[PDB]
Amino acid sequence: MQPPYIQERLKSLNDIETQLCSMLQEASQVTFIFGELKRGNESVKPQFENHVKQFYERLDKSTTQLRKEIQLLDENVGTNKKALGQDTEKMEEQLDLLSAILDPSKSK
Amino acid sequence: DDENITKLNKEIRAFDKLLNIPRRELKINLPLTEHKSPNLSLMLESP
Amino acid sequence: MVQQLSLFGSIGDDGYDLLISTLTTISGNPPLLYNSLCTVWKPNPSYDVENVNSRNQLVEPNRIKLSKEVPFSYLIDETMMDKPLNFRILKSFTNDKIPLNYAMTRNILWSLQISDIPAAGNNRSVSMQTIAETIILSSAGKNSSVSSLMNGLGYVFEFQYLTIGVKFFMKHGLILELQKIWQIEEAGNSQITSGGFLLKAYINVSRGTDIDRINYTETALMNLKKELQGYIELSVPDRQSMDSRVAHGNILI
Amino acid sequence: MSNQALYEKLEQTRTILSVKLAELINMTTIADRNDDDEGSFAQENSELAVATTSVMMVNNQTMQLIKNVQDLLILTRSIKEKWLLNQIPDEKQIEELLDNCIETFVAEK
C-alpha cells in the first residue's frame, strides 16, 4: 500500500472536490430561492442571508485549502528499484516451496 | 567492501555444492603379508 | 593510452542523499563505495635537464601520478564499525580530520600515469584529454620501495591527497563519480572540497584515430548532461586549469 | 509550472467573483429602472432586444460558471495524478537443505 502521507493528501483532495460539489449545490438552492424572493413572498427572506453567507464561506476556504496543497507541492520536492531485489525474493519463495516439498508431514 | 557485491558473492557461493563438478574417490587396501601392502586409489570425475 | 572525454560539476552536501536516489532511478544500479590515494612526483630540480630542446621545444617537463587503493580499515575509526560498509558512511565524512595521517602514508612508501593539457580550440563540447598509463606489479632488491624507484628515475615527491566517494556504472561504458578530496601534510589534513561533493562524468576511448566512436561518446555524454538539466549543471572546466606541466603551477581541485 | 497554475486559479477565482456580481446585479435590476434624473443611466430603447440581451446575460453566466468549475475539477485531478506519479522514492540452512534435496533425488533416481 502507499505510504500514509499520500493517503492524507488524497483524502484532502477528495474533501476539496466534495466541497466544490457542495458549493455548486448551494448555488443551485440560492438560485432557486431568489426566484420566489422575486415572486413576492417575504417569509424565506431570512434564509437568503444565511444561504449567501454559507455559499461565500464555502467558496473561499475550499480555494484556500487547495492553495495550501499547491504550496505543499513547493516544499515536497526533494523529499525498477524493486527489480534490484526482485529476483532475490523470488529465490526465497522457491526455496520455501522446496522446504514444503522436502517435509512430507507439512503437505496436508 | 560494498555490501551489495559481498551479498551477491555469498548468495552465489551458497550453491557451490550443487553447481560444482561431482567427484568420487575409492581407496582399496589389499591384505598382504611381509609388510608389503599395495594400495589402489581410483578417482572418478566428470570434467 | 586513452582519450578520456569528461564533464565536471559540483554539488552541496545538503542535496547529496537526494541526488543519490535520483541516480539509482536512472541507471538502475546501486552505488559502490571506493577510495584511492594519489602521490604526485616532479622532476628533481637539483639535476639540470639541458636536454630540453629550448630552440625547438620538442618536449616540456611534466608531473607523474602514482595511485594505489587503501583498505577501509585505515579510514574507519573506533566509532564506526557498527555501521555497515555502504555509501551512507560518507554522510559522516564532513570534518577536516581523518583517521589516515601523515605517518601511515610515509610508512606505505600501484598505477603510474601521465597526462597532457586538453586539446585546444573552442569547437570542443567535452573535455578531451590524452592519458598514458602503466602498472607496477612488484619489485625486489636492496632498496625496493616506491620512493627509491622514483628517485632512480629522477623524480621527487611533491604532495599527496586522498579521494573517497561513490561510483555509478551506466550503459555504453559511462562512469559517474562523486568524490571528496582530503589533502594530507605533516601539519595536518585539510578537506579542499569543503561542504560539498565533486561530480565527474567520463568515458574512455582506446584509440584516438577512430572518430565514429568518439562521436558516439560525445553524443552519449551530451545526452547525459541534457538529462540532468535543472538539477545539476555539468560544464567543461577551464582548459588552463587541467595543465600539469612543471613550468606553471596550478591544480584543479 | 505550479506558479502558472496558481495564477490561473487566481483569475479563475476573480472571474467567478466578477461574473457572480454581474449576474446578481443583472437579475436584481432585471426590473428595468426609470428615473427622471439625468444621473441614472438605464436605457431600454428597443423592446425585444432587451429580452435578447437578457438571454445573452443568462447564456454567458451559465457557460462561464460551468466552464470555470469544470476547469477547477480537472486541475485538481491533474494535481492528484502528479502526486501519484512524479514523487520518486541464513546460508548454512540452505546448505543442508540442498544437501538433503540432492541426496533424496539420488536415492529416488
Swiss-Prot record, chain A:
Changing residue 85 to S: Impairs interaction with SRB4/MED17. Keywords: Activator, Coiled coil, Nucleus, Transcription, Transcription regulation. Transmembrane segments: none annotated. Residues 56-100 form a coiled coil. It is found in: Nucleus. Present with 396 molecules/cell in log phase SD medium. This is Mediator of RNA polymerase II transcription subunit 11. One of its GO terms (molecular function) is transcription coactivator activity. The keyword Nucleus applies. Component of the Mediator complex, which is composed of at least 21 subunits that form three structurally distinct submodules. The Mediator head module contains MED6, MED8, MED11, SRB4/MED17, SRB5/MED18, ROX3/MED19, SRB2/MED20 and SRB6/MED22, the middle module contains MED1, MED4, NUT1/MED5, MED7, CSE2/MED9, NUT2/MED10, SRB7/MED21 and SOH1/MED31, and the tail module contains MED2, PGD1/MED3, RGR1/MED14, GAL11/MED15 and SIN4/MED16. The head and the middle modules interact directly with RNA polymerase II, whereas the elongated tail module interacts with gene-specific regulatory proteins. One of its GO terms (biological process) is positive regulation of transcription by RNA polymerase II.
Swiss-Prot record, chain B:
This is Mediator of RNA polymerase II transcription subunit 17. Component of the Mediator complex, a coactivator involved in the regulated transcription of nearly all RNA polymerase II-dependent genes. Mediator functions as a bridge to convey information from gene-specific regulatory proteins to the basal RNA polymerase II transcription machinery. The Mediator complex, having a compact conformation in its free form, is recruited to promoters by direct interactions with regulatory proteins and serves for the assembly of a functional preinitiation complex with RNA polymerase II and the general transcription factors. Component of the Mediator complex, which is composed of at least 21 subunits that form three structurally distinct submodules. The Mediator head module contains MED6, MED8, MED11, SRB4/MED17, SRB5/MED18, ROX3/MED19, SRB2/MED20 and SRB6/MED22, the middle module contains MED1, MED4, NUT1/MED5, MED7, CSE2/MED9, NUT2/MED10, SRB7/MED21 and SOH1/MED31, and the tail module contains MED2, PGD1/MED3, RGR1/MED14, GAL11/MED15 and SIN4/MED16. The head and the middle modules interact directly with RNA polymerase II, whereas the elongated tail module interacts with gene-specific regulatory proteins. It comes from the Eukaryota. It is found in: Nucleus.
Swiss-Prot record, chain C:
One of its GO terms (biological process) is positive regulation of transcription by RNA polymerase II. InterPro entries: Mediator_Med18. GO terms for cellular component: core mediator complex; mediator complex; nucleus. Gene3D superfamilies: Hypothetical Protein Pfu-838710-001 (2.40.320.10). Transmembrane segments: none annotated. It is found in: Nucleus. GO terms for molecular function: RNA polymerase II core promoter sequence-specific DNA binding; transcription coactivator activity; transcription coregulator activity. Keywords: Activator, Nucleus, Transcription, Transcription regulation. It holds the Pfam family Med18. The keyword Transcription applies. Belongs to the Mediator complex subunit 18 family. PANTHER family: MEDIATOR OF RNA POLYMERASE II TRANSCRIPTION SUBUNIT 18 (PTHR13321:SF2), MEDIATOR OF RNA POLYMERASE II TRANSCRIPTION, SUBUNIT 18 (PTHR13321). Present with 1011 molecules/cell in log phase SD medium. Component of the Mediator complex, a coactivator involved in the regulated transcription of nearly all RNA polymerase II-dependent genes. Mediator functions as a bridge to convey information from gene-specific regulatory proteins to the basal RNA polymerase II transcription machinery. The Mediator complex, having a compact conformation in its free form, is recruited to promoters by direct interactions with regulatory proteins and serves for the assembly of a functional preinitiation complex with RNA polymerase II and the general transcription factors. This is Mediator of RNA polymerase II transcription subunit 18. The gene is SRB5.
Curated annotation (Swiss-Prot), chain D:
Component of the Mediator complex, a coactivator involved in the regulated transcription of nearly all RNA polymerase II-dependent genes. Mediator functions as a bridge to convey information from gene-specific regulatory proteins to the basal RNA polymerase II transcription machinery. The Mediator complex, having a compact conformation in its free form, is recruited to promoters by direct interactions with regulatory proteins and serves for the assembly of a functional preinitiation complex with RNA polymerase II and the general transcription factors. GO terms for cellular component: core mediator complex; mediator complex; nucleus. Keywords: Acetylation, Activator, Nucleus, Transcription, Transcription regulation. InterPro entries: Med22, Med22_Saccharomyce. Belongs to the Mediator complex subunit 22 family. This is Mediator of RNA polymerase II transcription subunit 22. The modification N-acetylserine is found at residue 2. It comes from Saccharomyces cerevisiae (strain ATCC 204508 / S288c) (Baker's yeast). GO terms for biological process: positive regulation of transcription by RNA polymerase II; positive regulation of transcription elongation by RNA polymerase II; positive regulation of transcription initiation by RNA polymerase II; RNA polymerase II preinitiation complex assembly. It is found in: Nucleus. GO terms for molecular function: transcription coregulator activity. Gene3D superfamilies: Mediator of RNA polymerase II transcription subunit 22. It comes from the Eukaryota. Coiled coil: none annotated. Its main location: nucleus. It holds the Pfam family Med22.
